[PDB]
Amino acid sequence: ATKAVCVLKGDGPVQGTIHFEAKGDTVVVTGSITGLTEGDHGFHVHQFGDNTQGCTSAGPHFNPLSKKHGGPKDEERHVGDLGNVTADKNGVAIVDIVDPLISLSGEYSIIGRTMVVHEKPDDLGRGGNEESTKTGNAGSRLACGVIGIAK
Template sequence: MAQRSLKNFTTVRRTAALLTPVAVAAFLLAGCSPDENPTDAKGTQPSVVTGDRAPVDVGGVGQPSEGGEATATLRQPNGQPAGEASFESSEGSVIVTVKAENLAPGFHAMHLHAVGKCEPNSTAPSGGAPGDFLSAGSHLQVDGNTSHPASGDLVSIYINEEGKGETVTATDGFDIQQILETAIVIHEKPDNFGNIPTKYAPAPDEETLMTGDAGKRIACGVIEES
């Protein structure tokens, strides 16, 4: 059964260092004093080597990311403010921070949509009946990804009784350059990510796969480089 599942993305740093047999021997000799023989006892460590050491080139691992940053100002269909979103590159992922306001309490789906237009009462690029922020198009899919979850699928945001909410998540579904002049959209309902119990349907239909049954688009912001 084809389903979309929410992915938690965790940044993992891997550092690979390759040592030739000659380098290994040189390291062991450096750890012994001139009159000291290496020991065969398990669990021992070489003597501490003092003084400056040459830096090891590990191919940029651990270096600061230079992927850039982006922001979006969220607005409701009536033009009222609905919050802000920021996007920051960090070690192979993008950290997405959304601070929302003036929205109905509860969970609301969030997605990046392919077109950087946030027009109320507009039609989708593919045509059809008009609706709020439909000009933003469908969920973002970066080059090479055609499956679900879509590249632009994000976690839902929870809005409290005061109409405010904040969430921070990390994703490797896109980089900063791939989302410039796209749009972030908040929906009226949460995204089910295609998880439909089989007692209701043998499999999610195409609309569920494409939208997550998240309902109307209630806030939208064009993503721009900052």
Template sequence: MRKLQHRMGISAAALLFLTGCAAGESETGPTADPQPPEADVTEPAATATLNTVEGDEVGTVTFFEADEGTEVRVDAEGLEPGFYGFHIHGTGLCEPDSAAPDDPENTGAFLSAGGHLGVDEADHGAHAGDLPSLYVTESGQGSLMALTDGFTPSELLAAEDGNAAMIHEDSDNFANIPERYSPDGPDQATLDTGDAGARLACGVVE
């Protein structure tokens, strides 16, 4: 009789355990009504839409705050394959046919955006707005991600004249002209722009 009672006790305990599991408990903890983890989405602190002189949208630029500085992401499409100079310019105006802010006689594509951010403080390669070149593949797609401590998104947005993101038509040599090619060093145009050529696409930082 005692053995039968003992077995019944074990059976009742097992049934209780199984009932608990069915209600959402397991050996490792609750399993009922699981909730999906929240997605880790970081909103950009600033953005720019890149348009050509003809008004065609060819890409976007997003700026994210990072512990080490500012993360810049560029996504472009519809461009010819190759390397393109990419910079942040010191005036937030993207007028297709316009005059340079410091030289009204000098007119051309997106000259309203002024020179590179920090052009008056250093030679090219060390401007606050200098960034790595954008490479576009044979499919016409280009992508760039860079970390810079030359500026913060807040500084771009707070600038009195605004700022603009710019894709240039040519690759950027970052004023790296070896002495064997130029004993006197790079000329002023190279020190200002890195010979990146005409302005292909522009977007106001907002």
């Protein structure tokens, strides 16, 4: 697969559409999310494409190399760690990310896994407490969707 898509839904007002495209040894992530409180919100690939219990059944951040949490620019990060998206005063975040660790094929493939947007900012592992090194202190899961093959 060279293209993928994900539709984010939740039990509140947050919704969004995320697009993925392979380019060289990277994935280009674009799209938008609406219905958010103003400011930064944690954004990650989670391990399982399982929506039987809402966002809870997606499991933890996708982590096939068994590392601690970080930001996307850090060497020590989970494969799924894509940092923060930023919402404007109208509650809209535009997504614009290029990432070298996620993939659409092979061992680090995110096809069939879950994208999640969170309640609070991701502190990129620099919060100075233990939770920072697991989830970035991003808090509850507001919306999610399974990542699918696109035309």
